[PDB]
Amino acid sequence: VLGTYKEIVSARSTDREIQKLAQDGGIVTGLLAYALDEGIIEGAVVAGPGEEFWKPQPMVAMSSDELKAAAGTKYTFSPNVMMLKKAVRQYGIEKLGTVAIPCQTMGIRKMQTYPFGVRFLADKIKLLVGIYCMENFPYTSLQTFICEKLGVSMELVEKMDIGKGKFWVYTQDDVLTLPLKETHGYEQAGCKICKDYVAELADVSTGSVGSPDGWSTVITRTDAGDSIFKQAVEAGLFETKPIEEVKPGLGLLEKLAAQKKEKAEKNIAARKEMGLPTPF
Amino acid sequence: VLGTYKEIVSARSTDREIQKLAQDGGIVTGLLAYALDEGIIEGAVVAGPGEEFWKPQPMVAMSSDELKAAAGTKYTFSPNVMMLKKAVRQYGIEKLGTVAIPCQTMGIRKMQTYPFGVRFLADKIKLLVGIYCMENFPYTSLQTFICEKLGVSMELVEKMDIGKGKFWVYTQDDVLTLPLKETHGYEQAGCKICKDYVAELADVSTGSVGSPDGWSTVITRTDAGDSIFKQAVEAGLFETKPIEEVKPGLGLLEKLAAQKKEKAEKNIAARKEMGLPTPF
Amino acid sequence: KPRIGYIHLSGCTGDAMSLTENYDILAELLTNMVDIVYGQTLVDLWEMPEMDLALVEGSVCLQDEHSLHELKELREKAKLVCAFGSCAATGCFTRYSRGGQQAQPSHESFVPIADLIDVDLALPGCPPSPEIIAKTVVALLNNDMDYLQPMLDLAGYTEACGCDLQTKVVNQGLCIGCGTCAMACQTRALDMTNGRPELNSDRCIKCGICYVQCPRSWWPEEQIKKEL
Amino acid sequence: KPRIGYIHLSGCTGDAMSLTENYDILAELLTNMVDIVYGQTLVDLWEMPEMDLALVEGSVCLQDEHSLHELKELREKAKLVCAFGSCAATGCFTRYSRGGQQAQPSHESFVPIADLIDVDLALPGCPPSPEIIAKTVVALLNNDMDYLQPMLDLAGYTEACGCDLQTKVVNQGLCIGCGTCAMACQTRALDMTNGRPELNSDRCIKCGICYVQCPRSWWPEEQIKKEL
Amino acid sequence: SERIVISPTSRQEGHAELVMEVDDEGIVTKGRYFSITPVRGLEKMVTGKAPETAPVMVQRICGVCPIPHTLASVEAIDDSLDIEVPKAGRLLRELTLAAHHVNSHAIHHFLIAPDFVPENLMADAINSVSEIRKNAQYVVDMVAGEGIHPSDVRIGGMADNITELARKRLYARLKQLKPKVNEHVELMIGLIEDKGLPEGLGVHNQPTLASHQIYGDRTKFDLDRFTEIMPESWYDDPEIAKRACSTIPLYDGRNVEVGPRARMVEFQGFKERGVVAQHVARALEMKTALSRAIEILDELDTSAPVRADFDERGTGKLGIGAIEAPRGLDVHMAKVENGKIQFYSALVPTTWNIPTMGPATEGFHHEYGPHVIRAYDPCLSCATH
Amino acid sequence: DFDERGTGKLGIGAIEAPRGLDVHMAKVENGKIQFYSALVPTTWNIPTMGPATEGFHHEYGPHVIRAYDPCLSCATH
Ligand SMILES: Cc1cc2nc3c(=O)[nH]c(=O)nc-3n(C[C@H](O)[C@H](O)[C@H](O)COP(=O)(O)OP(=O)(O)OC[C@H]3O[C@@H](n4cnc5c(N)ncnc54)[C@H](O)[C@@H]3O)c2cc1C
Ligand SMILES: Cc1cc2nc3c(=O)[nH]c(=O)nc-3n(C[C@H](O)[C@H](O)[C@H](O)COP(=O)(O)OP(=O)(O)OC[C@H]3O[C@@H](n4cnc5c(N)ncnc54)[C@H](O)[C@@H]3O)c2cc1C
Ligand code: SF4
Ligand code: SF4
Ligand code: SF4
Ligand code: SF4
Ligand code: SF4
Ligand code: SF4
Ligand code: SF4
Ligand code: SF4
Ligand SMILES: [Fe+2]
Ligand SMILES: [Fe+2]
Ligand SMILES: [Fe+3]
Ligand code: NI
Ligand code: NI
Ligand SMILES: [Zn+2]
């Protein structure tokens, strides 16, 4: 199931630019950008854009214009969380909000619970945003798909998204898709045991799944995130329609989340049966 | 007691140069140099002379003239044994003989027994020479003695030797001595547990103790070393007089060796009583 | 009222400073929150009273007669002995030391106090962040061990390379490349090459914060309660 | 007649080469001294016979289905399983690996075989010197375990930094600065600053030869018999 | 039809699985060779790590052809850095490479000897290879520190330079070795023909590649010509493409077989082609190597410095080092920025081969087909790294 | 940007620590330190502190020492 949440909605940011470049909803960029206006967050750390093509390197952007450049989806490790110490420390930020995969997200909260050598950082994060991640792959793992599978340069894909039951590459003059079952080997060994499809820890969680194309479903895990969201909707940046009403049913998203847990659980049994240490 | 040995003798090398610069007997330099003539050893690794003053840095000398420069005593760690791989490898040496403290000496034999990643080196050493060491001290530990204790520069001491019951510094125009009980803190923590006063492992062992000043007592642990020695005495390089006859009695040397064992043994009990790992 | 005792065997003393860092708590805290006894730095009574917990700043040194002598005394005196700061917990930068620097050229060996005496809990860091240290004290003061379960576990930890999260986790195939562990580097030795952590030894103090802060290394579901 | 089996899971294969190095023994040795079975390199039978001892060149990889599958088979097949070369014994240079190099970007984790299955003895080295490997085989063939006492002990060894003789020995205050361990570096990473060993990580493969060759780490009085 | 899978193929370093599609007669139709070894991942592990490391980690890629790997890495790095080895330093590298070719080839003979040599001979045959092998090692270890895995070669020079006493000691050993090696090849050459594998075995139309007979020239190489493509494209089967652990490196879009056979045809002039031909080529090839061994040795400065001092922090610019490994051409490209490698790529001689090997095992009855593969003497650990 | 490999020549850096003057001398040869020496502000003080605690009744005497606010960890390193 989903992690306990205040509410579930599917929403899109109003702005033309967010719709234009945002992967789905444009909610992460819109939600993050709005906070800047409100000032709940001084700056946020958003992955991209890296030296390689379609390679994300984490960057902390005070500027809204900068957040827009960051906005998009790159399916590779971008260790967002490395920045957090750097962002708070030099471009001194009293409160900073970051976009975190569920995975990174697991990493931050314990740290907020158990700083253990993070000084003063722990208080500083104001809004943490969690993006559902089924699996994500090494740049090379990713690179093979685009080329052996899709016969296109890394340069050409303007945007890449994993559509339900498929991988989609959007290139000027074309869209190319390959089945996920094709994808199965490549994602990192670490993710084999990643329990949380949704970001349970994250204050607000945004995902493509369970919402129509161009519509992003945002689920508000925690009250602070909820507040920021309520404020934004009042702002009218986002058009929100309750999730249950719009197909696909959020029950489908729930099923996807459940599937992930089934996958994690046996893997752990296998790792547990075997010698090698396991967290969880 | 002494390690099992073929014979005990007190001897001096004949040559004026060996007597002139050799610490005691001049046997190590004489024995090593002769082998070069005979050719049992292609080259040997002898500590000194280092970049610092009276600091030994190990050097492998094919040349006899070079061995003479090496000859002397420097009471500091010189890791002779580091060279052995280097000497055999580049200045390619089929058979190489080295002068080793008992301590180093312990290190080589196991290696000859258990090469474990030393290739071909193990066979190559032909004559290993062991020098009795009661204790030896870090360069700084040594440095304090010469200056706080003796009020002399490190430059001035032409030769430093530990006389029985004393430390002797020989400087042009003077000889300066301080009691060993003064010395007690400084020698390395490692030596606290060094069992072997004599070099039991070494093929032939040479020490000042138990022989009159300027006379060195050489005890032949093993047959190959014994052979090289028998050959040298036939050579007449060394004047040899059986040990028992000349005071001080080798029984005194034996007593000194015993004292060392008593010191090692309790230290080990203390280390054993305590958590920290111990070899031996 | 609860008695906290901190004895610094051989420590940069950052750990103590971190303790003073939690200012808002601090002024009241010594006065109201906690009782501090037998701290040479913070107090002047030479022989230690029994103390509810003892905080030991620095790695013990084998050679120094006093440090060893003091450590043995400490175990009886402190009902609970907790080693804090890496230097007590992991031996920290101390490990790099090779003795032979004057004066006292002999002192070359330092070991985490933990190896010498069983230690109830050690929380590492160089220093530990002030907040963690405050959180434990309130926790210890308020007597909850669901929270300190991770630390009780961490007492075992001892030697910790930067090198080790690579052996401990990335090798296991646990690592997901989140980047959390690099952020938890006081030294800043760790950094992330795509996407795994790559660290450069010239600059690692072996504090151990990176092994501890990886989500993968051990996940408390304790926190979930804390947010909500 | 005794059956020796060597299976190389993932190894530079130096270890096998070292085996051929002992030339004087070697030509006769396969023929007279020992029987070699189920070596893909040295023989062509696909499924392993029971073997008196099994020599495993390289660290197993968790991801690869075959290597793991093979390792499980090996334990039944080999009456005695011995892991040789650091790559089986300590995981060696393998540890540095972070997976993600094509093809097969996924394979990122390698572990010493020893962790997966109990291993009777492992003799490390990268490769092991030919002589040690010959000495063991004669020893194993001639059935003496006073000699192999150190190795049986070494099977436990697993992770080994260059860093570790500093923690394992120099810290303990054991080190006497003989210089033996630096000489036993295939990499040449170790070198002696006065007078202790100082090693530079950029160049250490974690083979573990330095911890093993220090006289201090473990002294056999076995050798004394060998000379005399 | 029926497809027979041999896994792993015997007598070659590492593991490769050969998959065959056969007609009723059993003449093969498609031969697929892929390396199923797990990737130790050196190319990646080196990245973001210091230049000083790169030669040490890299040579572990392959403990048989370690010297070529070390040489290539240093050359690639020194080139990116721009250090200039002094001539004695350069000569030492060439001298080591030659000793290595000689040795490596001998090791190959030991491995394939069982098919080739009668048992009565074989104990004697094996002994000789060990004899030739043992002398060659003396040179490789003596010049380059312990070898295999010599640690002595270093960026911009050699760690130290052999003493005249060492150089002399070496020479007699190499010069004296020359008669045995000459005879050894003839016996090997004599043996290989006797087997009489069907003529026309293992003939492929693939282009050969050589830079130099021993030491490789970077200049005679085209980044423009070169390309690397993942097995996923190249292989017929999804299963096989996924299984294969090795990228295929394409020369001018053409699968390329690079070998002693290739090194001879390009440089020596070796008109004959066959599997028997590859075998013949391996013998004469060591024959040539060993010569240079002694050649460079006689004229060696012995006091000229080996090390050239260099600046580790590097311009972004990438450099290529190509040297000829006993199993075929090799190149290392590295770019050093900030004194830590930013991009590292290695193409090992086997890597070039593995695509050509499958087409080679077609036609002749498959029992033959592993014979073709074994002729290439591939070492996978090199192919995959 | 700078070149790590260094001339043998030693250099001194002196900055004022809260407890008194401090200097670090280092010589870098081959890019690895060859001689390193640190004198920390307390180190300078410790000899002067003993003579300072003379005269006035000793109960006072620790007061003098404490005024210097020495940090030993600095003094000894
Ligand atoms: C690795 C990965 C896997 C995902 N898998 C799914 C999925 O299976 N189903 C699904 O519905 N949604 C998935 N998402 C998220 C989803 O695809 C949309 O990207 C996002 O949830 C919708 O936000 P948006 O419409 O506002 O897009 P945007 O406004 O473009 O928001 C995208 C934000 O994601 C951040 N980001 C990009 N790449 C990374 C990265 N590697 N790590 C951390 N942050 C990053 C960027 O900073 C950017 O600000 C995934 C995202 C990532 C990074
Ligand atoms: C650290 C140390 C402690 C010693 N303690 C004693 C003692 O207590 N009683 C005693 O009778 N003799 C002791 N000796 C040896 C003795 O003092 C004479 O040095 C030697 O035994 C006599 O040989 P010789 O007269 O031929 O002198 P030489 O011909 O001068 O022989 C001296 C040789 O010792 C080698 N050497 C010098 N320093 C070192 C070092 N640090 N490590 C290894 N090798 C070195 C040199 O290569 C030189 O070749 C000690 C030697 C050392 C190095
Ligand atoms: S699948 Fe899990 S471990 Fe992998 S990126 Fe997503 S959240 Fe992280
Ligand atoms: S006292 Fe023992 S450990 Fe110390 S130098 Fe002498 S032999 Fe070595
Ligand atoms: S743990 Fe860190 S801050 Fe504390 S004494 Fe040790 S080195 Fe200093
Ligand atoms: S926290 Fe762990 S998994 Fe995450 S980036 Fe760091 S080492 Fe990798
Ligand atoms: S990498 Fe950083 S956190 Fe990890 S042990 Fe080293 S100094 Fe500490
Ligand atoms: S132990 Fe060394 S030589 Fe053997 S496979 Fe491993 S890295 Fe190669
Ligand atoms: S062998 Fe051990 S004691 Fe001897 S020099 Fe090396 S590390 Fe130091
Ligand atoms: S320092 Fe040398 S011997 Fe020790 S582990 Fe590293 S590479 Fe091996
Ligand atoms: Fe490659
Ligand atoms: Fe100082
Ligand atoms: Fe190769
Ligand atoms: Ni190879
Ligand atoms: Ni200070
Ligand atoms: Zn380490």
Numbering used by the authors:
A (entry chain C), B (entry chain C): 2 to 281
C (entry chain B), D (entry chain B): 46 to 273
E (entry chain A): 2 to 386
F (entry chain A): 310 to 386
Verbatim from the authors:
Frh is a key enzyme in the metabolism of methanogenic archaea, where the reduction of carbon dioxide to methane involves the oxidation of four molecules of H2 by a number of different hydrogenases. Our cryo-EM study showed that the Frh complex is a dodecamer with tetrahedral symmetry.
Refinement of this smaller dataset under otherwise identical conditions resulted in maps with better resolution than the full dataset, and the best map, with 6 frames averaged, extended to 3.36 Å resolution. The resulting shift of residues brings the cysteine residues C206 and C208, which are conserved in the FrhG family, near a strong density on the dimer axis between two FrhG subunits. The cysteines of the dimer partner are just a few Å away, and the density in between the four cysteine side chains is strongly suggestive of a coordinated ion. The function of this ion is most likely to stabilize the dodecameric complex, but its location between the two medial FeS clusters at a distance of only 9 Å, which is less than the distance of ∼10 Å between adjacent FeS clusters in the electron transfer chains, means that a role in electron transfer cannot be ruled out. In the Falcon II map, the clusters are not just featureless blobs, but their tetrahedral coordination (mostly by cysteine residues, or, in one case, an aspartate) can be clearly seen. The FAD cofactor in FrhB has continuous density in the map, and its folded conformation with the adenine and isoalloxazine moieties in close proximity is confirmed. For the new Falcon-II map, we used an Frh sample with a large excess of F420, but the F420 binding pocket is clearly empty.
